[PDB]
Design a protein around this nucleic acid. Structure first.
Ligand code: MG
Lengths: 178, 52, 429, 54, 180, 97
RNA sequence: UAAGUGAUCUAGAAAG
């Protein structure tokens, strides 16, 4: 109701904060928000804005968000239909383009999840700018998204995936390993 | 400073620009006045003794 | 002539809107983009420094300016704030004026009157970072993010403008419902209220909904930013409510809990479609009109509530940018599907496209309605609809769209469903 | 649709090449205005002639 | 003209806030500076020396009242904010005086030029704005000191130096510093 | 109106005129500590980047000292002190090339 | 190392 009885995301965020729900229920709240976002036909800036507001507000909310994210890619991602999944990815990208730290945990794991990842990447590209985005990625530890070590043609799959959605540096990586 | 509206009515002619029909407020001393509630007579209770 | 021709393209294969067969050609002339809208033209000139200077000089020659009264009597956009509105630099201001003069010279006054009081000249420069303009009822502030200080989190209302080559969200464009549109809305509300001493509360409510829907469907994204519009909505809604309460000869705030208004007609209520229970953005009106702004301190919104959060129509309307992006996606998808069908030799079924059925502009579903062949010959229809205003007494409030050619651009059954929930559930009601 | 049109226009403005650059003083001027009384001052003779063309 | 810049001693400055030989002696007493510097010195408002090599031979640098007038302007209206200069020395290093001499230009030119030189010196010397600080006295009751502390914390510059106990009374006469 | 922010008047408004201060406001205020990250990144990106006079000063000091000495011990006449001072100056000059 | 305090309009009777 709060989410839907609010013009901008900011207002919604404020309303949520008014409630002052316990550090227990923050995760639940986040989940609910995510669900709501999914429900809407396409990705809205509103939800993202709300998330940002929450995130800035407190470390516990950040933690909750992180937890939610973990839950998603791990166990709740494969349940969603495509459009919804895409929307979710976009939202996550938005969150991660600025507010979140790029911390990401990613042959077997490739159906819905892979497409979600792709969507996220696209979102990031849109927000940032390709080269800049790449640089940012490099800056963080990032072993899951781009594993540096060759590991006997395991990076080939990743490269292929990257190629499927217009991206760079993969080729360079491939060259490096031989 | 955020220039709160608390400060406006305290120094009207200063902090507020174009004040009109504004009366002047008071600006006071502090009231050390101690009343005994335990039925006792002339006691330094709430405060502390001199040095010497 | 030549420029016009270039804009058009060649006759055998003309350009689409704002596209050119080459970049060099586009570069050549000072004018870049044109669009007349219904006798309200929009010209984007892109000058170099040398070019600008010459123009300025010419202007000076025409009309000497020793006291410097060119910034004075210059159409700037009061809706925006003093920092983000067009800055009055003695170069930039002069340049715009010169341009305007040139334009005026180009047409004879006898054929059409291009007045300075009518006109507006925004100028992007090293000193002016906000390319501002009002189109169609929107006030758009295009602010490139390279010029922006800290590239803050994308708000709601802002369209992130995208570079088509690199796919980068390279600029921002902030929206606000132009004051004229707000005024129009207010007028409409007044009309609805006036000449309604009788009317069945429900009829009035319906009218209000229609008005509100028109307002919100037309500028979905662009409402959020404009506070005046929000205020008006709050006021308008309240007025509407009071109309109903006027009928019942009271207006005692307890005797009309939101139940009676927002409850749908299918539980005996009026079934209004509120946009009033929003906590409006308040701000330092000292620093609001002046300089710069941020969303701090919410104002009350409309009523005393029993912690009954009545949902708001806006959250059930897909903001325009999103819609456009969706359209871009699903039309491409549709095309792909068609191609596939062709390859495989089949008629493309409407059950396969289900999923992206009520998604797009025009809504995908405009292809496969059972009366399409005839509407393909109805060309120049939008214009006709627009011009309807001058033929009819009471006009369409949804002139901008048209169901048959576009499909239902909004849907509000979800809202209906949720209002009841907000009001406790059915039992409570 | 008008909002769509507006969006398109915005995109175009963004998508013009070197449009936001201000290194060499590339001054972009957006002029907007009404063609005042454009309906109210058509001559019918001239109009007729114009029509005859099309 | 080339003029240097260096801050005076904090104690010295404080003293200042609260006959050439005599002046020199005083200076020595204050900061234990060199005697040459003392001899050259001639200050206002802060400090102005005339300590090059050739000035003792030269008669151009001699008669420096007019010159010092120019400096006063600089002191009044500094470089950073066009706001007054404080706790600064100004020792001359060299003076570019031409062969041709005219009383109208020589003085007038110096007037701007001196100020400019001063500004340059300031720039060189890692300049910093100095805001003032109010010394504060508050006289809270006993139990409200924490509140006061909190308030102080909330303001940017702030320092509770000592919470003096006002005898025979509840009051905690708390000395403070708060930037104006 | 409180801190320039409340709605001017309760009438007209068609609303309570109540004013919750937002908790997005705080967020907006704060990220110079937590925007901060961006700033840090920027910093990281751009992170890597007279003797004669002194001699003269010394000479002057020496001269002053000499003068003081003269004042202290038998030099009411100027010629003597001046002479000695001159000599000292000469010596100094010799020392510095 | 520091979030989350407060601002809350109204308010019906006659005749037409
Ligand atoms: Mg009558």
């Amino acid at each position: 109701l709060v989410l839907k009885s609010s013009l901008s995301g900011d207002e919604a965020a404020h309303k949520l904060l008014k409630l002052k729900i316990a550090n227990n229920l923050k995760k639940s709240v986040v989940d609910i928000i995510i669900k709501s976002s999914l429900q809407e036909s396409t990705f809205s800036k509103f939800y993202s804005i709300l998330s940002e507001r929450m995130i800035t507000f407190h470390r516990s909310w950040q933690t909750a968000y992180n937890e939610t994210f973990e839950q998603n890619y791990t166990q709740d991602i494969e349940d969603y239909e495509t459009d919804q999944l895409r929307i979710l990815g976009k939202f996550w990208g938005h969150l991660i383009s600025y507010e979140f730290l790029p911390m990401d945990c990613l042959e077997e794991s490739c159906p819905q999840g892979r497409i979600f990842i792709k969507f996220l990447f696209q979102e990031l590209v849109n927000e940032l700018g390709l080269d800049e985005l790449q640089l940012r990625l490099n800056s963080s530890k990032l072993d899951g998204m781009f594993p540096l070590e060759g590991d006997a043609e395991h990076i080939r799959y990743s490269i292929n995936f990257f190629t499927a959605i217009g991206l760079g540096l993969l080729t360079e990586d491939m060259r490096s390993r031989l | 400073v955020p220039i709160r509206s608390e400060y406006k009515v305290a120094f009207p002619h200063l902090y507020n620009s174009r004040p009109r029909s504004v009366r002047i407020p008071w600006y006071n001393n502090p009231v050390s006045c101690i009343i005994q509630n335990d039925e006792e007579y002339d006691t330094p209770a709430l405060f502390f003794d001199p040095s010497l | 002539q030549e420029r016009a021709t270039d804009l058009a393209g060649p006759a055998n294969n003309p350009n689409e809107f704002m596209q050119f067969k080459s970049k060099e050609v586009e570069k050549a002339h000072p004018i870049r983009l044109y669009t007349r809208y219904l006798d309200r033209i929009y010209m984007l000139f892109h000058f170099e420094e040398d070019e600008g200077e010459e123009l300025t000089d010419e202007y000076l020659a025409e009309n000497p300016d020793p006291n410097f009264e060119n910034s004075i009597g210059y159409n700037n956009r009061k809706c925006w704030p003093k920092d983000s509105r067009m800055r009055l630099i003695r170069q930039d201001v002069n340049l715009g004026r010169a341009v305007f003069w040139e334009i005026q010279s180009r047409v004879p006054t006898s054929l059409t009157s291009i007045k300075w009081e009518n006109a507006f000249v925004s100028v992007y420069s090293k000193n002016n970072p906000n390319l501002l303009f009002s189109m169609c009822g929107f006030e758009v502030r295009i602010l490139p993010r390279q010029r922006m200080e800290e590239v803050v989190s994308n708000d709601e209302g802002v369209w992130d403008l995208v570079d088509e080559r690199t796919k980068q969200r390279t600029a921002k464009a902030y929206l606000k419902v132009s004051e004229e549109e707000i005024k129009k809305f207010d007028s409409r509300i007044r009309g609805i209220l006036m000449a309604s001493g009788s009317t069945t509360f429900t009829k009035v409510a319906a009218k209000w909904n229609t008005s509100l829907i028109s307002l919100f469907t037309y500028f979905r994204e662009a409402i959020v930013a404009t506070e005046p519009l929000l205020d008006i909505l709050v006021k308008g809604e309240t007025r509407i409510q009071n109309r109903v309460k006027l009928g019942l000869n009271s207006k005692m705030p307890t005797r009309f809990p939101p139940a009676v208004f927002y409850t749908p007609k299918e539980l005996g209520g009026l079934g209004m479609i509120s946009a009033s229970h929003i906590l409006i953005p308040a701000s330092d009106l000292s620093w609001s009109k002046q300089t710069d702004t941020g969303i701090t301190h919410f104002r009350a919104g409309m009523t005393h509530e029993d912690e009954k959060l009545i949902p708001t129509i806006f959250r059930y309307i897909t903001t325009w940018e999103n819609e456009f992006l969706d359209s871009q996606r699903v039309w491409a998808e549709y095309a792909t599907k068609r191609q596939e069908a062709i390859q495989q030799n089949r008629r493309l079924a409407f059950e396969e496209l289900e999923g992206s059925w009520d998604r797009g502009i025009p809504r995908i579903s405009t292809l496969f309605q059972r009366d399409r062949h005839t509407l393909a010959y109805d060309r120049g229809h939008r214009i006709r609809r627009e011009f309807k205003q001058y033929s009819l007494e009471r006009n369409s409030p949804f002139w901008w769209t048209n169901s048959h050619h576009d499909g239902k651009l909004w849907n509000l059954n979800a809202y209906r469903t949720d209002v009841i929930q907000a009001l406790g559930g059915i039992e409570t009601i | 649709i008008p909002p769509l049109l507006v969006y398109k226009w915005t995109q175009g403005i963004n998508n013009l090449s070197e449009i936001w650059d201000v290194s060499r003083g590339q001054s972009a001027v957006l002029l907007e205005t009404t063609l005042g009384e454009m309906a109210e001052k058509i001559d019918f003779t001239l109009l007729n002639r114009l029509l005859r063309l099309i | 003209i080339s003029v240097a810049a260096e801050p005076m001693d904090s104690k010295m400055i404080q003293d200042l806030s609260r006959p050439r030989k005599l002046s020199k002696i005083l200076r020595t007493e204050y900061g234990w500076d060199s005697l040459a510097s003392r001899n050259v010195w001639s200050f206002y408002n802060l400090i102005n020396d005339t300590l090059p090599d050739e000035i003792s031979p030269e008669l151009l640098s001699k008669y420096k009242e007019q010159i010092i007038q120019g400096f006063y302007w600089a002191v009044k209206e500094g470089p950073l904010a066009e706001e007054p200069i404080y706790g600064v020395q100004y020792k001359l290093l060299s003076i570019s005086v031409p062969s041709d001499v005219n009383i109208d230009v020589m003085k007038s030119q110096i007037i701007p030029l001196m100020k400019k030189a001063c500004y340059v010196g300031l720039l060189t010397a890692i300049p910093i704005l100095l805001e003032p600080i109010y010394e504060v006295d508050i006289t809270v009751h006993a139990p409200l000191l924490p509140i006061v502390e909190e308030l102080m914390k909330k303001r940017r510059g702030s320092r509770i130096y000592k919470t003096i106990k006002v005898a025979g009374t509840p009051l905690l006469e708390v000395r403070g510093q708060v930037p104006v | 109106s409180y801190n320039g922010i409340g709605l001017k008047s309760a009438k007209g408004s068609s609303t309570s005129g109540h004013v919750q201060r937002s908790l997005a406001s705080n967020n907006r205020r704060r990220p110079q500590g937590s925007q901060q990250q961006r700033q840090q990144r920027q910093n990281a990106i751009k992170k890597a980047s007279i003797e004669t006079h002194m001699e003269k000063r010394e000479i002057e000091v020496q001269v002053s000292e000499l003068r003081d000495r003269l004042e202290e011990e038998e030099t009411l006449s100027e010629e003597q002190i001046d002479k000695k001072c001159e000599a000292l100056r000469a010596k100094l000059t010799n020392e510095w090339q």
